[PDB]
Design a protein around this ligand. Structure first.
Ligand SMILES: O=C(CO)N[C@H]1[C@H]([C@H](O)[C@H](O)CO)O[C@](O)(C(=O)O)C[C@@H]1O
Ligand SMILES: O=C(CO)N[C@H]1[C@H]([C@H](O)[C@H](O)CO)O[C@](O)(C(=O)O)C[C@@H]1O
Lengths: 495, 497
């Protein structure tokens, strides 16, 4: 079966377990929820601009920390009073584990290997959370002291504006120092260069030179791990997270076809940044690009599910919507489903009771088969600077005009019900819309009470004749008698 | 050098030479203007829904024609009186040629090799001109009698709604009858399948089964040409015209990577349909996709240059703007520049005096190098039904907001002037500090209003002096912020040593 790669971020475990002395036994139990599922690999993130373990070459999260002191101390001063409580949870929990001689990543790796999971280290290569606050606890003293090493000096409109420029040798050396320590300190099966935090690593306009620079950096990483294979006596993998379309990937200085062909990486994770999980990604094109290279292609899901970038909705995926994306992507040739931000609490799916069910279904077409699923239209949140953007929603239809929406619904539906659903933003009757799926007339059903995630405007349901649906993309065509704007579209498949 | 491939359409010669009695010598003389140029292959197109030659298996353009009759005769009755004169120039020149025992395509093929040019035939697979007019002279009787074989029966909002559905067996057989006759009648160096007239071949939603079907159809074509290889005593090439981006090509049922890997085709032309040349096409991606297949990748240019699909401007490329596109696409790895609608008259660049210079320059970075060129921002006119569209212009900038435009300018600039030029739509006057323009992060000095040569917008264009050493090989980034709300309708890089 393809199976699941699940990412545990750098902060979550420390935020959620704060205020309790953690025993080695408890730390170990975290790995156990993942045993005997479709999870093949845990990607354990130990860093932002700072480490959550006791690094000797970077700043740990607790550098500057007074354990005994009040919340209002120099490290937390720049935060509002209530946000210091959460930040100090992370800082104090990670500190107290060090004090107790517990290395969390050393214990998780060891427990993974007992429970038949492959343990990975995922490194955040260029995290910029809260760089609007130059005094923030989670920035490195290296970032604070070296404003000249940033990507964009002439403006500050986005956090990525203040990310590090890997065009600079001092910047590449800074990140290679952590990878050198991480190789030494931890015997992991694989290192995953998480380029997708936050995906922007070069001066605007120098991305072509950047592609050469990143390919050369990757080669140095692979050479280092080749040396640790001998010391460690087992193969060590190298993977990377990159954008969802191949033109955007190259446009952000990530030429992965070259990394693959030169044998530098053996896994690639195509993924959005954050704003929504892309239900539509061109997997088939990447498979053709990567033919013969021995690289596993993983399709990355994010937790949010949102219809367009300006939407005020911030709801997460549900078991049904993840079943929809999983079936789609596996059908298109994904060799792994990768879950970022699907954790056991706080940053997680809102229907959390379904978590164990999810970890045992979405890694295979046979386990998803004949279970209800939802294929929601969304959008690509990440484009190279000045690259034309393609955003389906929202969509206006004037009187007598036609609008089409293609949605990837993966395997041909089993015997059962198929609904096409359309949310209208801003007053329709049953004859205002004519809806066809693959040419075929769909019967009006009336208003549909959607489970979360759902818009906050009316959703109208159309009955699709079962035999209309095909394998892969499905085409919703509509014409309106009155001017309307669409803000949501999905297929629901219910055997 | 990569060189040029140049497409002569099915109608143009007959339109422009109408009302002269043509001799064999004159007919031969057409090829001669392409001799001693960077043109390597003439793509000769003999068909729409009707052939311009005397077919035995399809309708010639003159089926139903009364040579002696008046303009107002059955074949032309459906047309406005003025439009009848031009239509009949096409029908009567193609008819008279046949009456005088001249097969125009036989003669062009022969002359081509006398002149060192490789001659190709280029078939239009699904032309739909004027299908709003059910009684139009240039439709096949097969098309008129078989409305059930069209793509879309539930509406007529575009010509492509009445295109044929290649998902049907009877449609494939109809187009395979023409290929079988073309391979028998003409000794060509290769056949091009022109899928991009007009690009839409399948019922909306069935493009996945369409891909499997067109791959098998391409496999039958290749197998048939393998047979003719032994009869003709030399190699016959098979090529196709496909969309500009791999996701759209597959979405319209064209899996060219499979055609290339299975050895079905040895040339692919990536191209827009019509509405504008694309100056930005992902050549480098296609090159990675086709690696190890020996397929010749050609970048197709169209004659129109327009900034956005809803623009009312209909101006053609200039020598400078083709220099621009050509340099960009070669720099990116195009193994040929392919010209569509760049004829010798009527359907032609507006600066026609510069056509001989064009056919001697755009074929190599060496012959383009140091020469004035323009790199204009446009748009891709063709997307798969319901595929989201990425259109850069027009672009609104609110006060203190930033907008970026990435323009592919191919080779680094030689010692000279580089200008970023930006057209502002609407009735709003800017000051010289209204805009802040950066290229690859570097400030560009306001130059004032630019008087662009055609093609150009009908709204003010402002020029910014780019520091030379800012510019890089490949994509170059324009970043703009405005102190007042503005809409951009035009962007370019002008590079003049
Ligand atoms: O906000 C929290 C928990 O309070 N953690 C966030 C977490 C957090 O801000 C970082 O781990 C800080 O280094 O960041 C992410 O992992 C992310 O980058 O997508 C999402 C997660 O919700
Ligand atoms: O309209 C005319 C004749 O004046 N020729 C047009 C020509 C013409 O309509 C067709 O050859 C008729 O089948 O079509 C094209 O080649 C085209 O498809 O882009 C354009 C060309 O300008």
């Amino acid at each position: 079966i393809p199976g699941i790669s699940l990412n545990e971020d750098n902060s979550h475990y420390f935020y959620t377990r704060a205020g309790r002395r953690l025993s080695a036994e408890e730390v170990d139990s975290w790995v156990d929820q993942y045993a005997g599922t479709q999870v093949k690999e845990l990607m354990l993130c130990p860093n932002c601009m700072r480490t959550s373990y006791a690094s000797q070459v970077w700043d740990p999260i607790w550098r500057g920390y007074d354990p005994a002191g009040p919340d209002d101390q120099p490290l937390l001063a720049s935060l509002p009073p209530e946000e210091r409580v959460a930040a100090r949870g992370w800082i104090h929990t990670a500190w107290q584990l060090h004090q107790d001689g517990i290395d969390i990543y050393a214990r998780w790796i060891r427990r993974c290997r007992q429970r038949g999971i492959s343990p990975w280290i995922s490194m955040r290569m260029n995290d910029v959370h809260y760089v609007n606050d130059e005094r923030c606890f989670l920035h490195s003293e290296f970032w604070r002291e070296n404003p000249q090493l940033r990507r964009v000096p002439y403006r500050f409109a986005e956090w990525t504006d203040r990310a590090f420029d890997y065009g600079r040798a001092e910047v590449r050396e800074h990140h290679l120092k952590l990878i050198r320590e991480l190789a030494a300190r931890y015997d992991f099966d694989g290192l995953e260069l998480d380029w997708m935090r936050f995906g922007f690593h070069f001066r605007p306009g120098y991305e072509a030179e950047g592609a050469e620079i990143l390919t050369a950096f990757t080669a140095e990483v692979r050479r280092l791990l080749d040396d640790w294979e001998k010391r460690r006596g087992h193969k060590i993998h190298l993977g990377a997270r990159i954008p969802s379309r191949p033109a955007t990937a190259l446009g952000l200085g990530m030429d992965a076809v070259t990394w693959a062909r030169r044998g530098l990486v053996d896994m690639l994770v195509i993924t959005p940044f954050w704003a929504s999980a892309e239900t539509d990604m061109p997997v088939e094109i990447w498979r053709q690009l990567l033919e013969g290279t021995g690289v596993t292609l993983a399709a990355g899901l994010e937790v949010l599910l949102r219809p367009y970038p300006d939407s005020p909705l911030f709801q997460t995926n549900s078991l049904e919507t993840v079943r929809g994306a999983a079936a789609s992507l596996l059908d298109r040739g994904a060799q792994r489903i990768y879950l970022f931000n699907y954790m056991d609490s706080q940053t997680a799916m809102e229907d959390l009771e379904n978590y164990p069910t999810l970890l045992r279904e979405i890694g295979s077409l046979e386990t998803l088969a004949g279970k209800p699923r939802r294929h929601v239209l969304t959008f690509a949140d990440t484009w190279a600077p000045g690259e034309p953007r393609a955003i389906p929603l929202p969509a206006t239809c004037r009187p007598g005009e036609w609008r089409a929406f293609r949605l990837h619904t993966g395997p041909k539906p089993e015997p059962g019900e198929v609904i096409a659903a359309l949310g209208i933003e801003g007053a329709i009757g049953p004859e205002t819309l004519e809806v066809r799926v693959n040419g075929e007339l769909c019967a009006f059903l009336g208003l549909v009470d959607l489970s979360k995630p759902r818009p906050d405007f009316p959703v109208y349901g159309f009955s699709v004749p079962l035999a209309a649906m095909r394998r892969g993309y499905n085409l919703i065509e509509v014409t309106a008698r009155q001017e309307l704007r669409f803000g949501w579209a999905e297929f629901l498949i219910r055997p």
